[PDB]
Amino acid sequence: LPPGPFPYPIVGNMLQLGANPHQVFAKLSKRYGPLMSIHLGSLYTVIVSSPEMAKEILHRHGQVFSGRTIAQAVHACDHDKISMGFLPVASEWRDMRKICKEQMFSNQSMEASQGLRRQKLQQLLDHVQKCSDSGRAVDIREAAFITTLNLMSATLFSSQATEFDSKATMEFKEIIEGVATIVGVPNFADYFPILRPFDPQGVKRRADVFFGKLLAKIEGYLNERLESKRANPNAPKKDDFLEIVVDIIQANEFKLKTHHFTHLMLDLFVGGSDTNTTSIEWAMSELVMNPDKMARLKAELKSVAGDEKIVDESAMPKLPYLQAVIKEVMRIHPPGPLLLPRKAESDQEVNGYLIPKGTQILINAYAIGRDPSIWTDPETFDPERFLDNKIDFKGQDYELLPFGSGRRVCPGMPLATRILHMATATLVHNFDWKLEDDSTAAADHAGELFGVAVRRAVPLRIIPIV
Numbered sequence: 001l002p003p004g005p006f007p008y009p010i011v012g013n014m015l016q017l018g019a020n021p022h023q024v025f026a027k028l029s030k031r032y033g034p035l036m037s038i039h040l041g042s043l044y045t046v047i048v049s050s051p052e053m054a055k056e057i058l059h060r061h062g063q064v065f066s067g068r069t070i071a072q073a074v075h076a077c078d079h080d081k082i083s084m085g086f087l088p089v090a091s092e093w094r095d096m097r098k099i100c101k102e103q104m105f106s107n108q109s110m111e112a113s114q115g116l117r118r119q120k121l122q123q124l125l126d127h128v129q130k131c132s133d134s135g136r137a138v139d140i141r142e143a144a145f146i147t148t149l150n151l152m153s154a155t156l157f158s159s160q161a162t163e164f165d166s167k168a169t170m171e172f173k174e175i176i177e178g179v180a181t182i183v184g185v186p187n188f189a190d191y192f193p194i195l196r197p198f199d200p201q202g203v204k205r206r207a208d209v210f211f212g213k214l215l216a217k218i219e220g221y222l223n224e225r226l227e228s229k230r231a232n233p234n235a236p237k238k239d240d241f242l243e244i245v246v247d248i249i250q251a252n253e254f255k256l257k258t259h260h261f262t263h264l265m266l267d268l269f270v271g272g273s274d275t276n277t278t279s280i281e282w283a284m285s286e287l288v289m290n291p292d293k294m295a296r297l298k299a300e301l302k303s304v305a306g307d308e309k310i311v312d313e314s315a316m317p318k319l320p321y322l323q324a325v326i327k328e329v330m331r332i333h334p335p336g337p338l339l340l341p342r343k344a345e346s347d348q349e350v351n352g353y354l355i356p357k358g359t360q361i362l363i364n365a366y367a368i369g370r371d372p373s374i375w376t377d378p379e380t381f382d383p384e385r386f387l388d389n390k391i392d393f394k395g396q397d398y399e400l401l402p403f404g405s406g407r408r409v410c411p412g413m414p415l416a417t418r419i420l421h422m423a424t425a426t427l428v429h430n431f432d433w434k435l436e437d438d439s440t441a442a443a444d445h446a447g448e449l450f451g452v453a454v455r456r457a458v459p460l461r462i463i464p465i466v
């Protein structure tokens with residue numbers, strides 16, 4: 001087996017992990033190497049911590065390592081048996097991946113929904129403008145969360161509510177927060193198989209409630225669209241993912257049931273929520289903490305957008321510094337620092353070590369992004385490192401893996417980058433910014449809180465200036 005820290009009876013290595021396990025794993029891998037054994041109680045895990053080993057696991061042996069380790073929480077509403085995020089690579093997963101790549105996240109689809117998203121960007125601008133008038137700080141975590149939910153709702157469901165903090169959006173927010181609280185803490189049933197039939201912390205039961213609420217909402221939207229289409233056969237077609245779902249269901253060419261589609265919408269909605277919210281906040285934190293970089297981005301946006309307040313998504317090729325800024329945020333702050341777990345589908349030798357069937361595989365993208373043998377001055381926020389650099393986060397550069405790579409690489413990437421780029425551009429282009437309170441600025445920026453997505457422990461509060 002790969003080398004690793006001595007595991008104690010019962011607990012294995014769990015007592016050493018602390019509040020930020022990705023940081024502890026990063027330190028440990030400097031000692032034990034880029035394939036490292038970790039015993040999470042009885043859940044045997046191998047941590048992968050170099051571009052070389054990431055390529056061996058995700059690419060060379062990409063089929064063997066194409067499964068997922070499935071948390072007990074994911075059994076909520078039988079999601080484990082239905083979800084593209086957790087099913088093994090087989091016909092159902094392949095069909096859903098095809099629908100995502102060719103239909104939902106196609107260039108045509110993303111382009112068709114730019115208008116839907118533009119409304120939500122305008123609402124963010126309005127919210128910040130009100131704060132600017134009163135000289136009050138913007139809670140960037142809250143504003144990013146609401147904006148992300150709005151942009152996701154707009155794209156998935158054509159939600160066109162005129163209030164920034166609409167009823168539907170705030171209901172989604174409560175559900176997403178609920179999921180995060182449930183899963184952000186260790187479920188002992190994941191680590192001790194004898195506890196699985198007991199659900200001793202009520203994690204699965206509580207997840208049932210929140211997944212159930214999300215599924216009921218999505219089912220309601222689907223039913224409403226089905227009826228509205230039946231009743232209005234001459235109305236123009238909507239430009240959202242729900243329209244695609246209806247058309248696929250009615251064409252009946254896939255061996256998939258209605259529940260595959262509703263659980264798929266659930267995965268897309270949840271998938272894009274905490275990840276984008278935390279990333280927008282980190283982007284703003286980095287830019288405010290590094291004023292020369294804020295100035296360079298503002299200058300780019302001024303030259304391209306001029307007096308226009310809301311940048312067109314189609315202008316992205318004209319904005320290389322904005323692209324570089326977001327690559328650099330992804331390098332330093334991958335929202336899932338250990339990605340999503342993979343699993344060995346069979347015994348496989350890698351670099352002379354046996355990885356047994358069933359092993360949980362965690363790619364420490366955070367460690368790779370901060371490794372000084374890979375990235376010069378890795379703790380420095382330096383978007384210029386990406387200018388005229390072909391390195392990207394699409395999965396082909398094993399130094400930069402915030403969306404993963406190989407078989408299960410993030411399918412929402414085309415929508416995620418539009419959300420990250422446009423929310424960041426909207427905030428930066430339209431206002432100057434200062435910290436509400438800078439007395440502990442450096443500590444506030446450095447301190448992370450582990451969870452579904454890693455976040456700044458102290459929410460970023462910044463005052464917009466005209």
Ligand code: HEM
Binds near residue numbers: 267
């Ligand atoms: C900045 C935002 C995002 C980051 C950093 C991110 C990151 C990831 C990562 C690391 C994985 C696992 C990849 C692997 O196993 O190799 C993933 C899977 C997934 N993501 Fe994303 N994601 C983001 C936004 C989104 C968005 C916007 C959607 C939907 C619109 C989405 C939907 C999914 C789904 C459904 C999977 C499961 C794919 C599978 O297992 O086949 N994510 N995400």
Ligand SMILES: [Mn+2]
Binds near residue numbers: 075078
């Ligand atoms: Mn189950």
